[PDB]
Nucleic acid binder design. Structure first.
Ligand SMILES: [K+]
Ligand SMILES: [Mg+2]
Ligand SMILES: [Mg+2]
Ligand SMILES: [Mg+2]
Ligand SMILES: [Mg+2]
Ligand SMILES: [Mg+2]
Ligand SMILES: [Mg+2]
Ligand SMILES: [Mg+2]
Ligand SMILES: [Mg+2]
Ligand SMILES: [Mg+2]
Ligand SMILES: [Mg+2]
Ligand SMILES: [Mg+2]
Ligand SMILES: [Mg+2]
Ligand SMILES: [Mg+2]
Ligand SMILES: [Mg+2]
Ligand SMILES: [Mg+2]
Ligand SMILES: [Mg+2]
Ligand SMILES: [Mg+2]
Ligand SMILES: [Mg+2]
Ligand SMILES: [Mg+2]
Ligand SMILES: [Mg+2]
Ligand SMILES: [Mg+2]
Ligand SMILES: [Mg+2]
Ligand SMILES: [Mg+2]
Ligand SMILES: [Mg+2]
Ligand SMILES: [Mg+2]
Ligand SMILES: [Mg+2]
Ligand SMILES: [Mg+2]
Ligand SMILES: [Mg+2]
Ligand SMILES: [Mg+2]
Ligand SMILES: [Mg+2]
Ligand SMILES: [Mg+2]
Ligand SMILES: [Mg+2]
Ligand SMILES: [Mg+2]
Ligand SMILES: [Mg+2]
Ligand SMILES: [Mg+2]
Ligand SMILES: [Mg+2]
Ligand SMILES: [Mg+2]
Ligand SMILES: [Mg+2]
Ligand SMILES: [Mg+2]
Ligand SMILES: [Mg+2]
Ligand SMILES: [Mg+2]
Ligand SMILES: [Mg+2]
Ligand SMILES: [Mg+2]
Ligand SMILES: [Mg+2]
Ligand SMILES: [Mg+2]
Ligand SMILES: [Mg+2]
Ligand SMILES: [Mg+2]
Ligand SMILES: [Mg+2]
Ligand SMILES: [Mg+2]
Ligand SMILES: [Mg+2]
Ligand SMILES: [Mg+2]
Ligand SMILES: [Mg+2]
Ligand SMILES: [Mg+2]
Lengths: 46, 93, 271
RNA sequence: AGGACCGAACCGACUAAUGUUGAAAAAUUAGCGGAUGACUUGUGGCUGGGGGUGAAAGGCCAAUCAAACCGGGAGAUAGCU
RNA sequence: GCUCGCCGGAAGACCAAGGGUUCCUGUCCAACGUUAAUCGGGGCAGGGUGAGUCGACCCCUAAGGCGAGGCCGAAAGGCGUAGUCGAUGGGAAACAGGUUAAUAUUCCUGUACUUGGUGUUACUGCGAAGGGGGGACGGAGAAGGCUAUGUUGGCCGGGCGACGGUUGUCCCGGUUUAAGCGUGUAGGCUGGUUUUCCAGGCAAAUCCGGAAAAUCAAGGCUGAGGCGUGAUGACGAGGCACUACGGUGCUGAAGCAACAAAUGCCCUGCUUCCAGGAAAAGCCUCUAAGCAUCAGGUAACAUCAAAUCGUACCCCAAACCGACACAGGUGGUCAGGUAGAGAAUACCAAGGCGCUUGAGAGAACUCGGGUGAAGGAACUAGGCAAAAUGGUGCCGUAACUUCGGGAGAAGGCACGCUGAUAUGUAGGUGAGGUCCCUCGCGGAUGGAGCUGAAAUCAGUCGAAGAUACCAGCUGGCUGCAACUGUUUAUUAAAAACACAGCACUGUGCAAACACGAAAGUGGACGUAUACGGUGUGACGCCUGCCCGGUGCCGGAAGGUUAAUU
């Protein structure tokens, strides 16, 4: 059957990518939380 | 006119393999490992300067580095650029 | 002409078509076309603000001269055309200096007819004049509400307005709704009725015909649940409520006009 | 000509058996409906939680829906076990 | 290796998405692989992806996004103008052969093509952020002309058969060739030219639009395919020589015609309908401020450049989405033979596979199937399930009906093979030939050869000829819903929803109404034959009485009545 995850890299990057995060202040707060946690991977970009 | 300092840096190693031996023995092509950001014009000028042979044409490709393991640790070898440089039939490097 | 389709299928049994074979069978006149993409009844918040809109056929917009401003220059009707944007047909006219325009096609107009606008135009269908140069008693259409703004009144197929009175700088119009309304006598109108009066005789015949027109189905309030609509809920069929809109406002009789700015122009409500 | 007819692809999902620590957190097999249309499908986009969307089943909104998910108020409160 | 079996509109082949070394070679078998494993998509090491023409990048825009100023909003922010992004769409150019263990339209061979930068020569008004043209667009249907492709014959090479026959109307194989260039064909569209003139194209214009003239009638555009060339080439049935027995090296004959033929092409055509069918650039052209024997245009030639990134491999799957090497899901392209209406189906080709536990035994019982005496729904909630019907042509077909239907109603008859008619018919296709020329890819007559159903009359085999696969059960009475549709993803598909149609009611446009502190936006670039809400639900005949209650509409005298004062 069709499951919920159907990958598209374009849609992934547009929805959750680094620049999408930087586009809004709440996105930048996501990035700030993740840096304060010390994530090795800030976004789905890499 | 590319600079000689730029030219001295873009040819890293000669590539040694059966495909490279056969390119040399069948097509008068030498296979080289070049700098990652080396362009075809740069590679051509660098070979025409430092190896002193006439170059007909340069073909290029990017080899992606393999994923390897090492003591239960994943890692990745670097990408690196390969150049097939064709000589003019009688140059004989 | 009005024509009933033969019942060679249930969806065709009730179809009544209005066919005008006078209408140009070719493509429109391209310099006077714009794209108009669909909304689905959604506004710039992306929310549905008018229900029951979506789908239907692609349509190009025909730029139509509602201002009728080229005074003193006669134009000849080249052809009548179908306009998907409106019930009225439109007429491509060619002015003597070479300009082509689209106008609302009035009843009785055909290719070869001459039309004119201005204070000097002759009083005949398709001619446009300020309503102070139009005799009291005239049937007009495409009537302005403000001078120079362009026609806003009586544009739909078969409609018209009657100039019933003129008092100095204002005329009293009888509009198709039954309303008596004041309009500045400097407003322009086109003589005659809007053509294509048989428009209202068509019978769609099936659901898909309304779908082609970009109308989406209406779900009755009483068919929903209480969370969805004031009419919702109840075992079987039950109403026990004064009928209201989806947002709780009485929908059988309760008046909703509220404009103290324009009250002074209404001589008599439509009743 | 047709929301026309029969019938594959394609879309669906009426009946039975199987399966129910499954081959599968909804399928398989034999039959079944639509199949030029209110059809179907790819890519991208928009609508955001008392909000959306709904040919309306309280349906659906990432295997979650009479108020999603994550984090926080938070060690809510628990005359109950 | 030899047999066997399975798929073959796929279980073959190529892509996109997605994945990312899984690709190839050597080695290893701990763990992983539902068993063993010498094997692997496993471990380890090494190798492998070559582009002016393919794709990205790039020019261009759609929805939509962001948005200098701006408008709005306690703050955060919202909306939006100029702009700027954004493909799923528009925009230049390459083909065939060969080759690697693993890449190839990228390497090699052979033959092409496009865009720009210069550098000369020659005629030379160039110039846009502006004007026009073009790009540029729907559905359905019909028919012709073709090709891909196939079949036969001819040709060429080979064979003379493990068992009766097989030198023949016998058997097997092959019979392939591109882009480009020339030719402008079937066919589609349009009258062509040259002048004077003008309230239109934000200015202007020699362009476009419009008008008025004379003149000439075949000019212009598009266009499959075919032919010629590309091609003395390549490839090529086979044969010969090595083998490091995995394959390479060398050599190479025929390379034609007729018929059949697409869902592909001509065709973005034609015909027709209503629901009336993107944008912008590339491109052509027109001129403005401006440059004006300068720049700049055109054409020729010469010479430069065409970067960067992707390219391995899987891709209906053991490599993607499903925790699995999981009977699930996943968009596009290719389309052979016999039979068949067919992309159904059966058997096959090219190709690819036997599904990663086996071996025995032949109990109950479970699952999936085959057959069944007599009876034939007695079963059961219920004919659930099963059994049954099933094709084509023709004969024939009831109530009722909205005149379309009901209808494939029902019911029935024929059906294989062989021969004759007719050494192969009706029909299609159509060579040589002769004639004519607005002289060619011409047209008329000509009909050789090829292909070719149906029928009728005889005969003939079987129990059975729509023989397999495939493939309607039928009728009668009645409730409900007019109908096609929609629905509870995952126990409900229905009488529920929708529906065309009907009615009430609101709404005069800065509409009502809806999203929104607002600005705004939808409604709608619509304007009462319109739009919103509500109920009813095709059609036919109809739709009675009640305004006391509640609501809504109207009313303005009197009572009651807020802030205020
Ligand atoms: K109800
Ligand atoms: Mg490359
Ligand atoms: Mg509505
Ligand atoms: Mg309705
Ligand atoms: Mg309900
Ligand atoms: Mg309520
Ligand atoms: Mg009830
Ligand atoms: Mg009651
Ligand atoms: Mg149908
Ligand atoms: Mg599919
Ligand atoms: Mg099934
Ligand atoms: Mg049906
Ligand atoms: Mg069908
Ligand atoms: Mg769910
Ligand atoms: Mg709650
Ligand atoms: Mg607390
Ligand atoms: Mg607690
Ligand atoms: Mg690996
Ligand atoms: Mg392998
Ligand atoms: Mg072992
Ligand atoms: Mg093992
Ligand atoms: Mg491996
Ligand atoms: Mg090259
Ligand atoms: Mg935009
Ligand atoms: Mg904005
Ligand atoms: Mg700003
Ligand atoms: Mg852009
Ligand atoms: Mg694209
Ligand atoms: Mg390969
Ligand atoms: Mg052919
Ligand atoms: Mg088709
Ligand atoms: Mg490949
Ligand atoms: Mg397996
Ligand atoms: Mg699988
Ligand atoms: Mg099949
Ligand atoms: Mg047994
Ligand atoms: Mg059994
Ligand atoms: Mg049996
Ligand atoms: Mg029996
Ligand atoms: Mg019996
Ligand atoms: Mg019986
Ligand atoms: Mg009984
Ligand atoms: Mg009993
Ligand atoms: Mg049954
Ligand atoms: Mg059966
Ligand atoms: Mg009953
Ligand atoms: Mg129904
Ligand atoms: Mg149905
Ligand atoms: Mg269900
Ligand atoms: Mg469903
Ligand atoms: Mg069900
Ligand atoms: Mg508005
Ligand atoms: Mg009813
Ligand atoms: Mg009802």
């Amino acid at each position: 059957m069709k499951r919920t995850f159907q990958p598209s890299v374009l849609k992934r990057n547009r929805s959750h990518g680094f620049r999408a995060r930087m586009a809004t202040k709440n996105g930048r707060q996501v990035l700030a939380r993740r840096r304060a946690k010390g994530r090795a991977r800030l976004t789905v970009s890499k | 006119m590319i600079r000689e300092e730029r030219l001295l840096k873009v040819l890293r190693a000669p590539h040694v393999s059966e495909k490279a031996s056969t390119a040399m023995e069948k097509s008068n092509t030498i296979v080289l490992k070049v700098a990652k950001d080396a362009t075809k014009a740069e590679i051509k000028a660098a070979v025409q300067k430092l190896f002193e042979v006439e170059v007909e044409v340069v073909n290029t490709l990017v080899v992606k580095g393999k994923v390897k393991r090492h003591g239960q640790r994943i890692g990745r070898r670097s990408d690196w650029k390969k150049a097939y440089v064709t000589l003019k039939e009688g140059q004989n490097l | 002409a009005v024509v009933k389709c033969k019942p060679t299928s249930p969806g065709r049994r009730h179809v009544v078509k209005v066919v005008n074979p006078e209408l140009h069978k070719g493509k429109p006149f391209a310099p006077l076309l714009e794209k108009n993409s669909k909304s689905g009844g959604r506004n710039n918040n992306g929310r549905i603000t008018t229900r029951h809109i979506g789908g239907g056929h692609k349509q190009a917009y025909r730029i139509v001269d509602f201002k009728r401003n080229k005074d003193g220059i006669p134009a000849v009707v080249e052809r009548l055309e179908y306009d998907p944007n409106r019930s009225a047909n439109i007429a491509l006219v060619l002015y003597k200096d070479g300009e082509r325009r689209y106008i609302l096609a009035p009843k009785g107009l055909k290719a070869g007819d001459q039309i004119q606008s201005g204070v000097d135009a002759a009083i005949k269908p398709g001619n446009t004049l300020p309503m102070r140069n139009i005799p009291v008693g005239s049937t007009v259409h495409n009537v302005e509400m403000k001078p120079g703004k362009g026609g806003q009144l009586a544009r739909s197929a078969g409609t018209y307005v009657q100039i019933v009175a003129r008092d100095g700088a204002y005329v009293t119009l009888r509009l198709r709704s039954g309303e008596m309304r004041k309009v500045e006598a400097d407003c322009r109108a086109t003589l005659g009725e809007v053509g294509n009066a048989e428009h209202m005789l068509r019978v769609l015949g099936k659901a898909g015909a309304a779908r082609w027109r970009g109308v989406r189905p209406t779900v009755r309030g009483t068919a929903m649940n209480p969370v969805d609509h004031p009419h919702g809920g109840g075992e079987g069929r039950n109403f026990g409520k004064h009928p209201v809109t989806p947002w709780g406002v009485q929908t059988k009789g309760k008046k909703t006009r509220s404009n103290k700015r324009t009250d002074k122009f209404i001589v008599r409500r439509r009743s």
